[PDB]
C-alpha cells in the first residue's frame, strides 16, 4: 500500500 513522502 502507499507509503508516500507526505503526512497521513
Amino acid at each position, epitope marked *: *500500500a*502507499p*507509503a*508516500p*513522502a*507526505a*503526512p497521513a
Partner: antibody
Amino acid sequence: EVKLQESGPGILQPSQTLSLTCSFSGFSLNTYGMGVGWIRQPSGKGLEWLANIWWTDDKYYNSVLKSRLTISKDTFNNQVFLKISSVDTADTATYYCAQLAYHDNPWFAYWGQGTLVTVSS
Amino acid sequence: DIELSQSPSSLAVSVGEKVTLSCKSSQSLLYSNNQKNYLAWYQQKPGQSPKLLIYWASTRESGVPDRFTGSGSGTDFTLTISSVKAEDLAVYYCQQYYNYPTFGGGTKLEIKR
C-alpha cells in the same frame, strides 16, 4: 502566482556542509496541505529526490542519503533549508526546490530555476 | 525504494509524428483502495527546470495541450505525444510517489529534420 528561488554557495570544499535556501512567495507552509521538496541533477544526468518538509513540520528523507540530510523551515514559513554534510565530488549537481502538489500530494507542481553546486578545493 | 525504467533512452522523431514513451515500475503503483496510479510525468526543455505534465498517471496539469496523453496501470505506463512539435524537444521523466519519490532515467526526445 508561485515563485521559488534557490540560494547556494556556488562552490564549497570536499567534507564541508552544503547549505541551500529555498525562498518562495504565492504560497506558505502556514496553509494546510503545503510543502517543499528538493531534487538534484548532475550535468547531463537525471533527477534524484533528496527530501520533503510539510506544514506539519514532518520531514521525509532519501533513504540512501538520509544520515547526511537535514531539512527545516523558519517560523515565518516563507523559507525552507536543506543541509548535506561531508560533501564529495558526486554531490556536484544542480539543486532545485519545488512546491509539493496542493493538498498533501507528493509530486512536484512548480520548480525553482535551480542553483549549480561544485564540490572542489 | 521503487525503481522506474524508461524506454527508449532516446527518440528521434519528425515534426507531426506520434511517439510513445514507456515507464516500467519494479512495484505496482495501483492502490486497490482508491484505484489511482501514483505516477507523474515531467518535461525538461534544454536550459529549463522540469515542468509538470501528468499526475495520477492520466490527469493533465492545466495548460498542458491535449496531444500529451498519460496512460497505463500497475507497472506499465506510457506518455503519448500525438503530433510532435519542434518545441517538444526535451528530456521526459516519469516519477512514482507510491513510496518515497524516485524518477526514471528519462527519455531524450530529439527532432529529425
